[PDB]
Design a binder for this molecule. Structure first.
Ligand SMILES: N[C@@H](Cc1c[nH]c2ccccc12)C(=O)O
Ligand SMILES: N[C@@H](Cc1c[nH]c2ccccc12)C(=O)O
Ligand SMILES: CC(C)=CCSP(=O)(O)OP(=O)(O)O
Ligand SMILES: CC(C)=CCSP(=O)(O)OP(=O)(O)O
Lengths: 428, 420
């Protein structure tokens, strides 16, 4: 019985017939990622015009910022975005059927001596996106980018001394788009790790210092920021959780979230709960309903528990993972709520994909997400229709969970590379 | 322009050798150019070069498992950060080439031997007839006490939640190649023993040496001192027992070396290991301490507490990590004080910088040849590498100060060398 194949997605096929590509890399990027992208839009019930709209913006504004087509045979920028270092990833917000994607902007100067840590390329991507969406605001972006990524002089200093960082993934910042309502919302992610190296500060001081400075002009972010920092400090100097990155929405400050992400090396339900409740600071009924769903997801997904080291910096393409990763959580500073809001990440990368898709579909059924439950596995398989589906262990990078307005919110972050007809065209 | 693949013994043996599978052939071409070039530059005689390379090819290569690639199942050895089961070291102070490997056979990693506790017996069987001075008395003792038996293996295999991402290596062998003969050593990793028995690695190792000391009372004093030193570091010590080695030679000639992993990478940490927390303060200890400090100053290890790294790295992935220090303490039967050897763990550091540090140290000791040829030879092992960007060749530099002689070895990535 012939099976569904994302390369048959009509919007993918039509756009392929329409599009001008002026280099090979972009063309490869399009054919590598668009089948899954178009198929995901379709199955998430985006109207046909919206499928076209989003795939065109992606092709015209984003693909030219994904650098050369990734192979193991030629140099490429390795992005912190995925374990394979590819600078593009789709996520399906399953609870709302919203498609999002994240990319790390890369341009000609990325990784050359003019931008050895890729701290400049993001401006050029913003330049292409800004005219498309009136609501895009860069005020907070500029602030965090200035405080938390390498400037030019820090870059040249670290490039000369790059013995200090060896094989460190260099990503400074990434952008993501939430696709909704014929519009998009823009988000950024900023990785202060190398900024920490060069300033001799810790990522925590950088992140919290920058947010405090911002709270001078935006006092409403201060109360959740204070609670967050008190929670972190309370975990002590041997905490298994450490600040890793910060995100904010690129819209007006009044509407923008700041999200502070902790890497949590202890994979256990207890560690997850502690993050969820900020060590028992959140005891409200809403938190507790959310908590029952965290526990349910924990029990379905069956992550391998225990302390997890940092993984190998990246996996070459084609390499089957043999690893399990730290959890993650972010804490959102809402301006209308004094208590930071958590979102937790079940880091499934390396786990059996069909098992994980089964855990997901069970969770979907239980939530009454009838259609999600019905279509999820079939659709997932269609993204990689030539794979040995039962042996895949690298599609599901993360499952997110938060509980917003008494509403379960879940996204899956999926390997997004060499999809559809591409493939034909020990210790765990 | 030097290239290890031009090494004559490697070229000539490559014309001579029968290989019965691809894996052994790949292993030979992957490792032999560096191994032959290393023997050449360490001034081994032509006959020794051939002799060591042949025994290596015939007795050892068939025990290295499938050729390591990222795209097929292989045994992941603790021996290297890439899980490859072969590594050459050069004892720079004596020009002695040594190598370590983890025996692997057909049953390794299967339900007949899921933790690779049996393969070693087969490798020993191949080596024994070549070296009369091999003795297994202490080896049998330690392996018995410190590695999984068949029963514990099946239990652990059925309960591998208890293992998780842990590298499973039970035991390794090393050959010191001197004077047309070789001395055999073993390294025994009691980590999984500890899981199944409920013992700490400390209890296992010290318990095992104490049971041995019944038959060999002379090892007891340095063992008591080592243990008193370790106990003195308390339950939150950043140093803990990791492995044990002994020579596979007659007990009267055999050293037992107990290894501590030291997560605190600092000069202070290294000095404390060197002097066993101030218990060693004789002139010879202090002379050695000077050299330790000088090495410290030259090598410039990234200081601070180092976490356990990823269990292993995929081949081809350059590291971004810095690792704990190591030290071993030797129990000599004629000396009541355990003798330390410390390890500067350079893995992940810029290799040319480390090579420059080493060259300077060689100069200062007047190892004038060592200093002249080291960088050149090192480059010739990986002649197509972007040498200045390499940060994974030097795994470790060892140092001890033996009968008032500086003793130094470098442990080097030994994989895909020469014209690979
Ligand atoms: N790979 C990222 C985590 C991540 C996965 N998907 C993402 C999408 C957007 C931002 C971050 C992510 C990290 O290690 O930190
Ligand atoms: N890889 C070993 C240390 C080591 C490096 N080279 C060696 C050679 C022989 C024995 C041990 C080693 C460990 O992690 O414990
Ligand atoms: C998967 C990880 C670690 C980060 C991305 S979180 P995100 O911005 O996608 O979160 P939301 O869009 O707010 O759900
Ligand atoms: C490099 C590490 C951690 C261990 C091996 S020590 P070794 O047996 O090679 O030391 P010697 O041969 O006694 O100098």
């Amino acid at each position: 019985m012939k099976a569904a194949n994302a390369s048959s997605a009509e919007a993918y096929r039509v756009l392929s017939r329409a599009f001008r590509f002026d280099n090979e890399d972009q063309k490869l990027w399009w054919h590598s990622t668009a089948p899954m992208f178009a198929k995901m839009l379709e199955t998430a019930n985006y109207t046909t015009p919206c499928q076209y709209q989003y795939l065109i913006t992606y092709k015209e504004c984003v693909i030219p910022s994904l650098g050369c087509y990734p192979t193991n045979s030629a140099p490429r920028w390795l992005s912190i975005l995925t374990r394979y270092g590819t600078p593009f990833e789709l996520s399906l917000n399953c609870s709302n059927s919203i498609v999002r994607y994240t990319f790390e902007p890369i341009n000609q100067h990325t990784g050359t001596d003019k931008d050895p840590f890729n701290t400049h390329a993001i401006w050029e991507s913003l330049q292409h996106l800004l005219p498309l969406e009136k609501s895009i605001d860069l005020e907070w972006f500029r602030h965090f980018k200035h405080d938390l990524t390498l400037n030019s002089e820090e870059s040249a200093f670290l490039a000369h001394n790059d013995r200090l960082v060896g094989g460190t993934i260099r990503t400074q910042n990434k952008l993501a788009l939430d696709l909704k309502d014929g519009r998009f919302a823009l988000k950024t992610y900023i990785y202060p790790a190398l900024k920490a190296v060069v300033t001799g500060k810790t990522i925590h001081e950088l992140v919290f210092g920058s947010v405090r400075r911002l709270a001078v002009r935006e006092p409403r972010i201060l109360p959740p920021l204070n609670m967050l920092e008190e929670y972190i400090r309370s975990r002590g100097s041997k905490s298994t959780a450490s600040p890793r990155l910060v995100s904010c929405d690129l819209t007006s400050p009044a509407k923008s979230r700041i999200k502070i992400y902790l890497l949590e090396q202890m994979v256990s339900l207890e560690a997850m709960e502690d993050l969820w409740t900020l060590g028992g600071r959140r005891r409200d009924a809403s938190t507790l309903e959310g908590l029952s769903l965290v526990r349910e997801l924990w029990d379905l997904i069956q992550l391998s528990p225990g302390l997890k080291s940092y993984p190998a910096p990246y996996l070459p393409l084609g390499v089957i993972p043999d690893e399990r990763l730290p959890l993650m959580a972010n804490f959102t500073l809402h301006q209308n709520d004094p208590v930071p809001e958590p979102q937790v990440y079940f880091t499934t990368f390396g786990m059996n994909d069909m098992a994980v898709a089964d855990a997901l579909t069970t969770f979907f059924e239980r939530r009454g997400w009838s259609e999600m439950a019905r279509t999820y596995e079939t659709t997932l398989k269609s993204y990689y229709p030539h794979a040995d589906h039962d042996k895949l262990n690298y599609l599901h990078a993360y499952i997110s969970f938060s509980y917003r307005d008494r509403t379960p919110y879940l996204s899956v972050y999926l390997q997004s590379f060499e999809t559809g007809d591409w493939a034909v065209a020990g210790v765990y």
